Design a protein around this ligand. Structure first.
Ligand SMILES: O[C@@H]1[C@@H](O)[C@H](O[C@@H]2CO[C@@H](O)[C@H](O)[C@H]2O)OC[C@H]1O
Ligand SMILES: O[C@@H]1[C@@H](O)[C@H](O[C@@H]2CO[C@@H](O)[C@H](O)[C@H]2O)OC[C@H]1O
Ligand SMILES: [Zn+2]
Ligand SMILES: [Zn+2]
Ligand SMILES: [Zn+2]
Ligand SMILES: [Zn+2]
Ligand SMILES: [Zn+2]
Ligand SMILES: [Zn+2]
Ligand SMILES: [Zn+2]
Length: 312
């Protein structure tokens, strides 16, 4: 009957999926992508390695294809991601330290300006913290210093006054050292007038290990004056699949969805793609996989039932 996107929208939220250009030829895949979800996130082609492959020369070719596709289906789009230590073209490291801030600002200005009025959110800075809450020592942190994050958000806001600006990261679903650091940063930004509208919890989880403090963590951020979104949701398991593992995964998805629906400022959920067929998990986590609601043959898993039930 009703799709996840329609059920979510009925409750003032979106339910989307990320997708990548190489997947679009798969007709069965795109059919579900366009009808089941209300929001889309470019999995890769909006990243620095693609949009500014050589200094000062921008390329939005691939990203454009995804945005148009979403627009064709009446789906909103989240920009992802402007500043990140990964998938960064090699020339960025060669930029003289004293010039990096200008370069980062420029990269942000061109990409944000280019998609102005077409996206709902922008993951401005991605994965800036270590698990212990300290700053990740990326090229930006090292050469620009602690203010690089704030400067990135300022630059984004200056290029597009209406798009929601998000700080995105993983392992910040539960209350702990990492989410605490993000919490303090957001608190600091609001105090100093640094633009920031939301926190993106990637939610790359492990079946059976969903943080019990998830709901409370989402709420404390909401109380700070920012929205929250689960941006790259997947719940991986150690292969092979079993009815028991599938069932645990279903319970987990249901719990995650309920946690969001309980908090007024949790605006939506995006799964990092929706079918195991194209999940990034097997590639990065050896021996793990089957992390999405649809399996490799597009069969809806028990996890889908749980999500739909939670959305009601
Ligand atoms: O490159 C990053 C991955 O290393 C990261 O994987 C996180 C590692 O800790 C696990 O507990 C998390 O579940 C897992 O997602 O994900 C983000 C990616 O950019
Ligand atoms: O295909 C892979 C992408 O799905 C992957 O996306 C990253 C996963 O970790 C998250 O923390 C990042 O925000 C997200 O962009 O990047 C690697 C690519 O090979
Ligand atoms: Zn994909
Ligand atoms: Zn090109
Ligand atoms: Zn276009
Ligand atoms: Zn342009
Ligand atoms: Zn704490
Ligand atoms: Zn199957
Ligand atoms: Zn069912």
């Amino acid at each position: 009957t009703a799709t996840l996107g329609e059920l979510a929208e009925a409750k003032g939220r979106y339910f989307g999926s990320a997708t990548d250009n190489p997947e679009l030829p798969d007709t069965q895949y795109t059919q579900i992508l366009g009808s089941e979800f209300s929001q889309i996130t470019p999995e890769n082609t909006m990243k620095w390695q693609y949009t500014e492959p050589s200094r000062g020369r921008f390329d939005y070719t691939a990203a454009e294809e995804i945005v148009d596709l979403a627009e064709s289906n009446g789906q909103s789009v989240r920009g992802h991601t402007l500043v990140w230590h990964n998938q960064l073209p090699s020339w960025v490291d060669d930029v003289p330290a004293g010039e990096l801030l200008g370069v980062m600002r420029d990269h942000i200005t061109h990409e944000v300006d280019h998609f102005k009025g077409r996206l709902i959110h922008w993951d401005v800075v991605n994965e800036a913290f270590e698990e212990d809450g300290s700053r990740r020592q990326s090229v930006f942190q090292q050469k620009i210093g602690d203010s690089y994050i704030a400067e990135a958000f300022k630059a984004a806001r200056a290029a597009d006054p209406d798009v929601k600006l998000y700080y995105n990261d993983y392992n910040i679903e539960g209350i702990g050292p990492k989410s605490d650091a993000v919490y303090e940063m957001v608190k600091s930004f609001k105090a100093q007038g640094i633009p920031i509208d939301g926190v993106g919890m990637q939610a790359h989880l492990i079946a059976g290990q969903v943080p019990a403090s998830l709901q409370e963590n989402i709420r404390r951020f909401a109380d700070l004056g920012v929205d929250v979104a689960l941006t790259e949701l997947d719940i991986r398991m150690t292969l092979p699949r079993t009815a028991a593992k599938d069932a645990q995964q279903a319970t987990d998805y249901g719990a995650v969805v309920e946690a969001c629906l309980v908090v007024s400022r949790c605006v939506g959920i995006t799964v990092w793609d929706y079918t195991d067929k194209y999940s990034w998990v097997p590639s990065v986590f050896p021996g793990q996989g089957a992390a999405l609601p649809w399996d490799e043959d597009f069969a809806k898993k028990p996890a889908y039932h749980a999500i739909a039930a939670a959305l009601n």
